[PDB]
Design a protein around this ligand. Sequence first.
Ligand SMILES: NC(=O)c1ccc[n+]([C@@H]2O[C@H](COP(=O)([O-])OP(=O)(O)OC[C@H]3O[C@@H](n4cnc5c(N)ncnc54)[C@H](OP(=O)(O)O)[C@@H]3O)[C@@H](O)[C@H]2O)c1
Ligand SMILES: NC(=O)c1ccc[n+]([C@@H]2O[C@H](COP(=O)([O-])OP(=O)(O)OC[C@H]3O[C@@H](n4cnc5c(N)ncnc54)[C@H](OP(=O)(O)O)[C@@H]3O)[C@@H](O)[C@H]2O)c1
Lengths: 453, 453
Amino acid sequence: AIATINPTTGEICQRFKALTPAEIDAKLAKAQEAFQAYRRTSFSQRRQWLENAAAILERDTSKFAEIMTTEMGKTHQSAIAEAEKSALVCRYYAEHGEQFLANEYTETQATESYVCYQPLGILLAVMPWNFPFWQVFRFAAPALMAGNVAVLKHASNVPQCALAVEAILEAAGFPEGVFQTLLIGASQVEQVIKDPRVKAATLTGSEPAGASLASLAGQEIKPTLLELGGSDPFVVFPSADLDEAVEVGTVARTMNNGQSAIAAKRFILHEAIAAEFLEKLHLKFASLKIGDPMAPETDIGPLATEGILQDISRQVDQAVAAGAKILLGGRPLDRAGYFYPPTILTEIPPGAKILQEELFAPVAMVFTVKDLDQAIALANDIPFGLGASAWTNDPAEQQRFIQELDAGAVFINGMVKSDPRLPFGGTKRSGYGRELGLAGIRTFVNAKTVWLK
Amino acid sequence: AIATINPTTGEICQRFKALTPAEIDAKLAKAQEAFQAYRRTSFSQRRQWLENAAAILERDTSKFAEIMTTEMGKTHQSAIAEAEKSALVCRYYAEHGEQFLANEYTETQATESYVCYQPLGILLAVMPWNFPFWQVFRFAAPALMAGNVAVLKHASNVPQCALAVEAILEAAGFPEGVFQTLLIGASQVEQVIKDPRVKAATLTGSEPAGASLASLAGQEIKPTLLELGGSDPFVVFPSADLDEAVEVGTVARTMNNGQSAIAAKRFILHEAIAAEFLEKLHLKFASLKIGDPMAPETDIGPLATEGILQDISRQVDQAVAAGAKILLGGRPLDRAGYFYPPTILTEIPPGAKILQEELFAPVAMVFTVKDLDQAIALANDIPFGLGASAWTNDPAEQQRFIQELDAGAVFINGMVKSDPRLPFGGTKRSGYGRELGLAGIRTFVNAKTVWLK
Ligand SMILES: NC(=O)c1ccc[n+]([C@@H]2O[C@H](COP(=O)([O-])OP(=O)(O)OC[C@H]3O[C@@H](n4cnc5c(N)ncnc54)[C@H](OP(=O)(O)O)[C@@H]3O)[C@@H](O)[C@H]2O)c1
Ligand SMILES: NC(=O)c1ccc[n+]([C@@H]2O[C@H](COP(=O)([O-])OP(=O)(O)OC[C@H]3O[C@@H](n4cnc5c(N)ncnc54)[C@H](OP(=O)(O)O)[C@@H]3O)[C@@H](O)[C@H]2O)c1
């Protein structure tokens, strides 16, 4: 079950043995001991080690990117970008961690009254295959800067990525036990959450996994953060810069072979520009290059696993049988590896099941609306609420989109992106809590109120 | 089940009918409609209504206090104080809510990039009988200032308090459906958390209730905050003002008839001062006036319920049977009402079960220690970590207590108290999240990242 299976060829490359319950317990004993020493290290020391990690990532972007591409199919170029972004968040918290965690004083009758910020202890992180480096470093950099230690349960299909991350942090100088990768199955996460030494947990992934982790953690009185799926709207109104919206919209839907929680999944087009936008989108998708993700000319690699392929294939077939129209694509390719083509679906019947589902593949759903009220209602008519993008140069419309779109992030005239400098997270069924910015490092600390007479 | 039973006399005073499932659903439908309009009200409007609520509390502290004393037995004077504190938190968020929720800008290449703070929707609050006004206003003031609406499930033994809080907010001018009291049992809370319109939940109370709420909320991908029990240490070292420590320590253990999560529960005394401290504590406890909580000279009223009385009686009897020494008290009083006397237990055998339990009654456990290392280890040798108090005038000792006590709040030379101006919350099995200060109002909002090209 824990194995590298190359999605370009379907070949099983490397298998790994899962930890036994005793071995998990041993890793946790080591983490606990490591935490006792690590919480006493200086911010200067942690900064040095994080900067070292950033430098390792910066130096070997291509090597790390090749691991990511091999294991889960994203283009080598996009994996290089992922390695760079991972270094970026390391540097961000190296640079800002101390100031972000400094005492905050409040004037009272006390001689001293303030809040200080101390680490909780061992944090469990459960992470997904789609950004196998970035999701890990997004969590790890602030967690470690704050003085926590971490155990990582990565997706079972990216074990080499999981081991690589641990190795980078060891090479950077972080003490043994400060960051450990657990080669374990989803069924074994319960043992970790139930362990008295584990103080908190974070999960990035899908709802079933997050519901399981958060319910178990809640039962144990442990705080959580969940970053789950999205069906983000990409709304285009008549005053939009249409050519830019088409180009950026195409990237947003097709990046990471469509496998992004913040992909543009539902294109919502004002009737006045819908025909032009849709033609241009159609043309853009029609000429994307599908193939070997190691080849620099490739736009679209294979989907990450056979299951991901079967899922989208089923979802699209069912929508089409219900009366959705296929403008482009809409069937898996007859070639080795888990290839699914760029696809555009239109005229989706009201109440079609697909309208409520996340399409984790390069498959655009397209909608025409008459006005702003309709656009907002449709954009929000999903269980999720992660990101949203809207395109308009009318100030009043911009403000309505900002205020009224039910999402954790609203981007005006650009595609949704995470950036270390700003917090990032979901609402509704997309989760809760915020990674990145100040929020990221404040999540897994004891905010201890101190009052000295 | 939902009833006023006067703990001073045992008299059943008023019975209330629990809402049916349909009636709960109707209140949630109303809350959802109310939220749509309420989220659009201005901060100046919310400030007016909250200040009105504060003025209502301020004007009728004695009337409200009598309800509290009647239902749950705290002294009328302490209930007056509770009503005053409830007004204080109302004014705090009325005064600060707008600035606390203002856009926070971060410089990037975007023309505008910032975080804004918008309400989630319907919040569920589950609250305990021990501070039946304060715990409610602690949650409600910031929740309402933020533009959320709230449904309250109060303890089944304080229904008059629960109805009173709703009535105050109605009289203050908050629209119908913005704050509603749900006269429902513990078993009906599941229906509320599972309702799709309910977006988040907070609970103040004990671990079993907290675990149930948080596990259910987690399963539904809904954020929570838990404020649970404590077994707070009260550490007294040789440089302390011993007389002040005795006086304050007595108040901390016996306030609210011992029924406080932040009571001083475990007195940890340096051997150099232990004999003098304990003599003085013994005399202070013995001098307390036990009787009718409506009488202004009463120090100790009855415990809130027959169950609370039975719990402490059993816990203490079992400790004594195991070899713990009764220095004072340690048996229920032979009189009408649920009276249990101020009690001091010493020489508790190592590994006695009581060492790990919360004593929700005026029962002090007392320990002698040789040094700071021993004091810290003992103070932290509990599942809880809510507050901690330490008494010393040695700066180095002060810093060790501040750094090393595993608690959400550390008070030096004073008893632990919540104050609207500072965040308040637990760690370990005492919960997570923070009420009060800036944190309180930031808990139940969508921190929405906005990026405009
Ligand atoms: N909001 C964000 O920042 C964000 C970002 C990226 C991705 N995502 C999400 O990631 C998803 C894509 O990955 P996916 O669908 O393969 O996610 P997934 O199945 O939920 O897997 C994510 C992680 O959870 C584990 N897992 C699965 N079931 C579990 C359970 N019952 N208990 C504990 N752990 C469990 C997986 O382990 P195994 O591999 O061993 O099963 C993996 O480590 C998207 O649907 C999107 O929702 C969200
Ligand atoms: N950290 C803090 O700020 C703080 C402050 C004050 C008190 N406390 C805690 O409050 C407690 C005092 O009251 P208590 O011991 O009687 O608390 P409790 O039993 O936990 O009751 C608190 C609330 O939870 C409800 N409840 C009980 N079981 C539930 C369940 N399974 N699901 C949903 N709700 C449930 C109760 O309703 P019913 O009455 O209908 O059973 C009540 O409304 C103390 O033990 C202390 O731990 C903490």
